[PDB]
Amino acid sequence: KKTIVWFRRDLRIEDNPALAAAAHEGSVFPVFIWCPEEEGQFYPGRASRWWMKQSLAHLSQSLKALGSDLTLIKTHNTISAILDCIRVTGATKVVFNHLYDPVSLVRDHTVKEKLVERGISVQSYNGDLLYEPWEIYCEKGKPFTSFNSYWKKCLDMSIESVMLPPPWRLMPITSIEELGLENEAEKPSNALLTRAWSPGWSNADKLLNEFIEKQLIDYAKNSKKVVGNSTSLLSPYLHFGEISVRHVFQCARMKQIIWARDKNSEGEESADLFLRGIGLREYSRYICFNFPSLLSHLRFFPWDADVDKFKAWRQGRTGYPLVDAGMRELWATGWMHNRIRVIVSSFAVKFLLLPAKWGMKYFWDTLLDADLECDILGWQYISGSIPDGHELDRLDNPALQGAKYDPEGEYIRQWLPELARLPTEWIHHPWDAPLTVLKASGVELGTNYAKPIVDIDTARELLAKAISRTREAQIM
Amino acid sequence: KKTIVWFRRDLRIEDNPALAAAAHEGSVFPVFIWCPEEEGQFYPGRASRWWMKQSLAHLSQSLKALGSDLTLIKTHNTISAILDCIRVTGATKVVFNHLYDPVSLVRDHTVKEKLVERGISVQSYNGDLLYEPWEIYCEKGKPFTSFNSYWKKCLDMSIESVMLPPPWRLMPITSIEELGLENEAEKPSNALLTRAWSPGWSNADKLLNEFIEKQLIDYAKNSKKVVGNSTSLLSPYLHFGEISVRHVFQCARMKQIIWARDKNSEGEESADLFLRGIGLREYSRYICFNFPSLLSHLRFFPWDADVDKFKAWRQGRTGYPLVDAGMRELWATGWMHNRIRVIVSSFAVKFLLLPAKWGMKYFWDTLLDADLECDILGWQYISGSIPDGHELDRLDNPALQGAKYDPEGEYIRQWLPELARLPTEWIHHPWDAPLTVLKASGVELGTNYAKPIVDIDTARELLAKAISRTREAQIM
Amino acid sequence: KKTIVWFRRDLRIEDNPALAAAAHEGSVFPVFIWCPEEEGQFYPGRASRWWMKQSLAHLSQSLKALGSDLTLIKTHNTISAILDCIRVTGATKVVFNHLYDPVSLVRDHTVKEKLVERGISVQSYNGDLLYEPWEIYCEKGKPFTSFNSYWKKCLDMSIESVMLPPPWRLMPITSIEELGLENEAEKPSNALLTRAWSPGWSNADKLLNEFIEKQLIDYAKNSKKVVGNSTSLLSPYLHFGEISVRHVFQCARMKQIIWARDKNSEGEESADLFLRGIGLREYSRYICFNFPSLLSHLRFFPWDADVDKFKAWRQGRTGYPLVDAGMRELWATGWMHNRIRVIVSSFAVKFLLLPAKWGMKYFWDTLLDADLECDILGWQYISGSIPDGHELDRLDNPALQGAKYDPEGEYIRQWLPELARLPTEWIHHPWDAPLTVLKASGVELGTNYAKPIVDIDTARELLAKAISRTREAQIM
Amino acid sequence: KKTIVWFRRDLRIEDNPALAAAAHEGSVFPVFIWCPEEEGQFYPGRASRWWMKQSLAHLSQSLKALGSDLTLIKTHNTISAILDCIRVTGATKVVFNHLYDPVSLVRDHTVKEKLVERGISVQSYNGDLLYEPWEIYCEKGKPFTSFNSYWKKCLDMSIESVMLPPPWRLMPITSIEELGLENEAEKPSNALLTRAWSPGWSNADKLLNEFIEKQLIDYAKNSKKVVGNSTSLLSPYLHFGEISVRHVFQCARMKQIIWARDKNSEGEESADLFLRGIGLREYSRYICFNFPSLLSHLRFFPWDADVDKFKAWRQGRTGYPLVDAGMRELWATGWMHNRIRVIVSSFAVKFLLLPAKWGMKYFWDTLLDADLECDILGWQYISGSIPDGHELDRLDNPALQGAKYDPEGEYIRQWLPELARLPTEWIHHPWDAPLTVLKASGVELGTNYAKPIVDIDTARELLAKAISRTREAQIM
Numbered sequence A, B, C, D: 001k002k003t004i005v006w007f008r009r010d011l012r013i014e015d016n017p018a019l020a021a022a023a024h025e026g027s028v029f030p031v032f033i034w035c036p037e038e039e040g041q042f043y044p045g046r047a048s049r050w051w052m053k054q055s056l057a058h059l060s061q062s063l064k065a066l067g068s069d070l071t072l073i074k075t076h077n078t079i080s081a082i083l084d085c086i087r088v089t090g091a092t093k094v095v096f097n098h099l100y101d102p103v104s105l106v107r108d109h110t111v112k113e114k115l116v117e118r119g120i121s122v123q124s125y126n127g128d129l130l131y132e133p134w135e136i137y138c139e140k141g142k143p144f145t146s147f148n149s150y151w152k153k154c155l156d157m158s159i160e161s162v163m164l165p166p167p168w169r170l171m172p173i174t175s176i177e178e179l180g181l182e183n184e185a186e187k188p189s190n191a192l193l194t195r196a197w198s199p200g201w202s203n204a205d206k207l208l209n210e211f212i213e214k215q216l217i218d219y220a221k222n223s224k225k226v227v228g229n230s231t232s233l234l235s236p237y238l239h240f241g242e243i244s245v246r247h248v249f250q251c252a253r254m255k256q257i258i259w260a261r262d263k264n265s266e267g268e269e270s271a272d273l274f275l276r277g278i279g280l281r282e283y284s285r286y287i288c289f290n291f292p293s294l295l296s297h298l299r300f301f302p303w304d305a306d307v308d309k310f311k312a313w314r315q316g317r318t319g320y321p322l323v324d325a326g327m328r329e330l331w332a333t334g335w336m337h338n339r340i341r342v343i344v345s346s347f348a349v350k351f352l353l354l355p356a357k358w359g360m361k362y363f364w365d366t367l368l369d370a371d372l373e374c375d376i377l378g379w380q381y382i383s384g385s386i387p388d389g390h391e392l393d394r395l396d397n398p399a400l401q402g403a404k405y406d407p408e409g410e411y412i413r414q415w416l417p418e419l420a421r422l423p424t425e426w427i428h429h430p431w432d433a434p435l436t437v438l439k440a441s442g443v444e445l446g447t448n449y450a451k452p453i454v455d456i457d458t459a460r461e462l463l464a465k466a467i468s469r470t471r472e473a474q475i476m
Ligand SMILES: Cc1cc2nc3c(=O)[nH]c(=O)nc-3n(C[C@H](O)[C@H](O)[C@H](O)COP(=O)(O)OP(=O)(O)OC[C@H]3O[C@@H](n4cnc5c(N)ncnc54)[C@H](O)[C@@H]3O)c2cc1C
Pocket: A223, A231, A232, A233, A234, A235, A236, A238, A239, A277, A278, A280, A281, A284, A336, A337, A338, A341, A342, A345, A367, A369, A370, A371, A372, A374, A375, A377, A378, A379, A381, A382
């Protein structure tokens, strides 16, 4: 009769099963409810609130071209807000799509019991995953604990889900500003993020075509290089649900059969490794559902509570050029390559030895794709929580990690133009360069480029004493 | 019979009248002589010696494909060096091309009398100019003193010179390394200039085609913008004589008649303004020939002899973002847009009030197109020596000169990535921004960006007291 | 356990429901059986047998890259041939896809009862249609009789079918040449069809991308012009089942939502008219299933049994330049634009008044997309059998049908280069041109271009006497 | 003071020495005089008069954009016409450019003596040649008699001429229609030549750029193939003087030094063979100047005066497909490839044995580049007049000349679409094909393709009897 489609993090119209199912019977009107106080400490950060504002306006005009209007409501309790929207419009059903983070699971469990008190039929759908996490089990019917044990089952699952076409027409018979999504001082500096990004589902479709046709071919040899645009740059579109992940899986498995029929064995190997990256997004929702504070294996660790070392880390003034170039790209554009996120966060935890909660809260505020389940899997991968993760006893050599991800030094020279005439054999560790090499370029360490804020042999021996105390503070 | 073609600053084979005339009679062999001690204080700088080294090797292989070999000689006196090359090879003639800087004029005057002592016929040719400076006169037969009085005569001169084809074959019947053109410490930092530049006459021809076909059309509206490659980037090719200037004048006047026949009035107006820039190169040789220390109208000026202000100027750490971005581009690439060269040199002379000799010697060492006659006309244009030049009583507003040459702030954000989230209305003067605007971006002045090293009202009143003393020290 | 996939007219691997269902359980091996004697008079023609030969070899190597081999069998009775293939390989199931022409419907009905005598499970699938013809009914549950009554129901059908991905791997545990598909005299003239066409499912995918990205935009204004490639040229791929028709419907309805979101109202109108052409392919299978000699409303028509008029028609020597250019393109390439097929077949039936069986048998032998159900709907559309078809009392003016489909005369000048200097106002009717116009070009009618073989006023009055006799021979 | 620039066959403004010299002193006005009755039998043909009409209108508007107007005069005596134009405008000088055909040499000799009777200074210039024909001599100072003896001297001539820039402005202080250049019946068939050609000097410049950048590279391997556009298509621009031939020589010798510096030895060899074709245009003016009826070595030849064989030759209905395709391209477009002009004219002279005057008059009427001196050299090359020409005792095999210039048969299939399904081993000689091959395509010889009008063994023995009679009729 009358159905509310409640948009939360599915801001698209293609392959939207809650919008497609409501457009079969009767009258539809779409609703977004901004209720950030139920998230608690996972209130959306500053750069994420800019992206929601831009793509809700993109979604509102596209629903108007199908013939409707998007209704906005601001409350401190969203379960009292859709119920007040039902009493106004006289609606009988509420349809929405699932979410899997642990805050929204107990929130969606309560809104179902809140609305059979008023006799409203509530239907929820799957719009985010390939399979649901209660479908992938082991031989005994128990959940997995490693990724490649989990991903070899999803590729042999005896089924696969489909892509729904969008509806042909919507019908209403007809709101708050909610534009509180930004402060007025931070407003012109937020608008400079549009030099690199453009939100909306119509732009997510153009970036999937641009990746499939240009650099998906070279992905198996280039996905670790930070020079050049070698990855898809799809992660803020995939976080807000502007591109369907089953739409990506279908199109990549169709390019793979054409390249196997040309015997292009490298382009075919690239299509296999790109789908493994999509399976890491599937796995982050999997262990969040099954094993829902966070990093408890580091709770007797002696952390250095130094706030000016934290200020030098986010300013990009540490004296380590891969860390400084990554922190300047993060502030300028709101995105980092995956291998640079490992570099700047291993530096914060192992070298400066600041608390990991401090760095997680800075990533939550400055990344455009700040995802609750993917930030958990990333910070557990660098701290050694995951079984098949990184080791904690190890510190990375700056010259070796420089040669892997930035072999010609062109990532450092783009973001630190003061080091543009420094040769590549010393550009990732300028404190080791001899004195006449440094002044053959225009570099004096301490005046126009910084000295290293901690020496590498200082923190390597400061960690082994700090590792060996939390081993005996845990046994007591 | 046997003819030496002495290459000095004409490193090409197309439109080379000394090479073309020698290839008519008999045996030819080419000679370069590196003799930098006759230049005195105009010894070629560090970046210029890198370009000569790369393009002599480019010229040597192209003369081999015509069938010869380039002979190199190093001496502290070049007039004793070609005479020793004549006695070895048994040559009868020496042909070369003219130069017009005041050191080479008295040096070429002496080598003619040095070689009729041995009975050697010496012929010199015009390879650098459209007309010779003893051909453009006024109505009474006297030289001009302004540029547009001079350039309206050259466009109505009753003649024009032609483009010689290269010879079809050369004939010898057959050297020092001279590779002393770089220090071994400065060698790997010099090689990083190849990220932006490629010397040689074959590359000068590809950059003339690339400019004529892409952005010569938009030159009349874009030649003052430093964002984007809006100019030709031909000046280090035109300084070393790898592209002929009569070849440029012919090809641009042929595009102008095609655009006038399509009634493309803006593309035709752009071709008129680009040839006016070539006439400024002609005019710099004109007043050097007629009026050959240099800036004597500022000789009782009180200069501040502060050497750490000079170190902060060439490091790009002054706190003025147009000056800092221009000084970082100059060190990284060896080239600046013409409007930025006015900005960074007016700042050194009017704000810091350092001696102009100090800044001229730094431009001589860091520019790839460091030309003796063009650096004279440029530094006389900013100091008020020229009649139709800049005023000396004026200081430029940083916001207004920012909006003219960098209207969207994309030149500052490329070279100073720390200011990438600062809005455009304050990016050229961050000390005027309110305090919540600066911390809405990641900018604290004094820690990750510098404070202005002198305030603008300090130096404006320091100049008016310094101007008014050299007015009375000159009358005494 | 072991399953035969019987390929008949579904020569692809993407969206193949019989191949996809067999690849779930066990061992698969593919089989084609050439049995042309069960078709009777619908034995495949000469150009169709060339295309089957080229695309079976294309399908055989693509099944090898998935790990199998295609087995070929030649029999005069295909129901005795798959049963002999089961006894060899020890297979338990046979899966295939439906067909809807009236010969294959009674043949598939008998092979099901032939194989439960041996206890073999037989499954058939839908691979050719959007919906099955027993699903589209009227309000009373009866089949339609007009096209636009039928197509307005298919666009409102409460369901739609999906696109299956191809299998990841096939398994056999392992044949006749059947290459009898061409005679040895006709073999080198058949191979010249490759100048215009390339069979195989991998080429059907490249022609769908090429049409969606280039000229689908302009289809609503260009689909009646025979100058230029304005249509998709997909019909021999769609006849042999090398491209899926649900794959076309999905991709065209996705381009339609992007163009509606740019307010490109003409590109959106073109996507609506292209899907109406696909619905004509759906409708031809619909009335073949419900109303399964053929043109019985012309059975007392007095036909002229003149065999040299039939020889002049297929040679393209009639003196009517649209008919002659269409007959020369048909012999050279094996394809005609849809508006030219109306022209050359209305000419054979209304002007020459030859029997329509004679022209249908020539189209069956010379077209690459000679489809049984689509040739029926086409020849019923020109003869007036269909209710919403052409009128039979009318003859078309050659100048008016020339201006509609060939407005600048460039289709005639391509295929009849003798008329290249004839102006456009007379190029479609040269017998009406004045005598000095014809000899201002190089045209003398009767020597280098033919006179019209029948005059237009002769056959217009010969038809009205021939129409009015079959009206009274039918009432008796 | 006042100067007439008399345009005859130099319809351009770039590199025009008579227009450039007049634009130095005073007032200029341009004049074309149409006087076709002084040419006698070399009255310009039908297709040439269409091109003059189109490019005089192109030249008139381009002189208006320089500020003048083109004056037209029609007379039966041009020497009385410019003298009447002098008396009207009060002009003092007449400047024009040389021509070298033997009619214009004695006409220009008389107009000089006609105008010193009135005291008018007459100056003539070189605008058509690289060198003048009184500058290329042998060792004794005598003219050459072979081409490669002549062209090895022009490449070693101790000089070369230059390219003048166009004037910047013209000055008048200010006519008949002459549009009689076409009949009103032939007017709409002449306008269809614009499908392939576009006259004017601005289009001659775009076709020189298009050839230098696309297919000059492949010229040494493709200049004998008639499939594809492998030559420059510059000959009607070079005949009417819309492109300068010194402009072509300069630009091709500049591409040759760039390709020699990349060691592109095939692109460099192509630039050498293209300039040899330009030297054939130079040589045709050379022997016309020195050895000024025409083919007197065939004057006792027994010619067959059959006028219906002449009608079948120009209709393209001989039964020889290379001759028929060349005659249909010539009538449609007005141009033929150089190897096809040898084929269709050797066929007219050796097979049909029609008088060569009959075929020369048909080429004069149907070619757009019908040049008096180049048609002489071409018809002397096929008849054996030239020493290094063709032999007269030989007749060419149609299969061998077919494989040289049309190896895949795609030139025949374009112009004779009736033979599109005939395989390549018989497409150049269909009378030798076996009977089942011809009817496997749609070819019956005598009905839809013609039988050969003379058999090849008939005319081979008819020529040897006709050769051997003019040997004894000449000795008497
Ligand atoms: C410390 C740390 C924190 C991270 N925080 C986040 C976060 O907040 N949000 C987030 O989306 N990703 C996070 N990641 C994962 C990774 O950095 C990004 O997903 C990656 O940069 C996406 O960029 P892309 O689209 O170009 O990658 P692509 O190579 O194009 O990857 C394709 C898609 O797969 C997914 N994906 C790829 N790699 C991973 C991965 N390792 N884990 C999960 N999903 C993946 C993303 O949706 C991505 O768009 C984090 C990683 C680390 C080490």
